[PDB]
Nucleic acid binder design. Structure first.
Ligand SMILES: [Zn+2]
Length: 259
DNA sequence: GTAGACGTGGAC
DNA sequence: GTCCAGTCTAC
């Protein structure tokens, strides 16, 4: 998931867990636990703490407890669900947080790529993986100036620039491809070749795209212009949508609308 | 940067 | 059977 999908998870999950106290933490795939390294220590420190809140930073979820903050990245297929501790678990459940009321928060991840870091609240934003993240796209911190500063300083493609979480946090393959189309810019061109008018236009479309996506609860898939539409006619000009590889990933675009 | 890594499963 | 699908990393 990207910012919109993670933001949607944050909103619906919060009311289901706020105020609940942790009684036990069970881990079925240790690799997911990154800090502390020892999964036994990870489990023991959260016992007895109550969930006080849930925030998002980039594509990360930040569970706020009493003293600690649990930082979770879903990567490609991680997902959360709340259910009764009396029912059988679903396939690929790797971590489970059991509460004192008999309910539990389950974490599933088919590909096992997700990660979890636990730090004291005051240290979380200063340690990895949150430490070097760029500004939030829906905040005053992100502006054309910030984009320009990083753009006019590299030779890599504009898609690579946008996928770099240190530049701006939250964009992935789907929204980078969609933002570039709406702004009318080819994904493979040098980030340093973009004019001042283009950068402003891109900033405008990035904010609007991510904003509309959050409103629709993420993929909004019915409002996609290019992602996954290769071979189909452009919604704006009718030219067949094409797909290639840019910055080591599948990239979708319209050869006429984007220049 | 442009591929391959890290587990697992669906499309063709 | 076999190519494709968020960060890291090493030829
Ligand atoms: Zn078009």
């Amino acid at each position: 998931p990207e910012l919109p999908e993670v933001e949607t998870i944050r909103r619906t999950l919060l009311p289901l867990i706020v105020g609940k106290t942790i009684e036990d933490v069970r881990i079925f795939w240790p690799n997911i636990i990154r800090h502390p390294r020892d999964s036994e220590a990870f489990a023991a420190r959260m016992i007895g703490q109550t969930v006080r809140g849930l925030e998002r930073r980039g594509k990360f979820l930040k569970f706020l407890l009493d003293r600690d903050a649990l930082i979770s990245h879903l990567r490609m297929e991680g997902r959360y669900a709340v259910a009764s501790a009396l029912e059988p678990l679903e396939p690929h459940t790797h971590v489970v947080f059991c509460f004192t009321d008999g309910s539990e928060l389950r974490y599933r991840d088919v590909r096992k790529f997700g990660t979890m870091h636990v730090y004291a609240k005051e240290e979380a934003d200063r340690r990895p993986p949150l430490a070097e993240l760029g500004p939030e796209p829906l905040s005053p911190a992100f502006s054309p100036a910030v984009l320009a500063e990083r753009a006019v300083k590299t030779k890599r493609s504009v898609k690579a620039l946008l996928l770099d979480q240190t530049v701006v946090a939250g964009f992935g393959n789907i929204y980078v491809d969609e933002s570039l189309f709406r702004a009318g810019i080819l994904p493979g061109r040098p980030a340093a070749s973009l004019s001042s008018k283009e950068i402003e236009r891109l900033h405008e479309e990035m904010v609007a795209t991510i904003g509309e996506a959050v409103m629709k609860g993420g993929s909004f898939q019915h409002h996609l212009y290019v992602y996954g539409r290769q071979g189909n006619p452009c919604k704006r000009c009718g030219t067949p949508i094409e797909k290639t590889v840019v910055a080591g990933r599948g990239t979708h675009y319209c050869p006429r609308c984007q220049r």
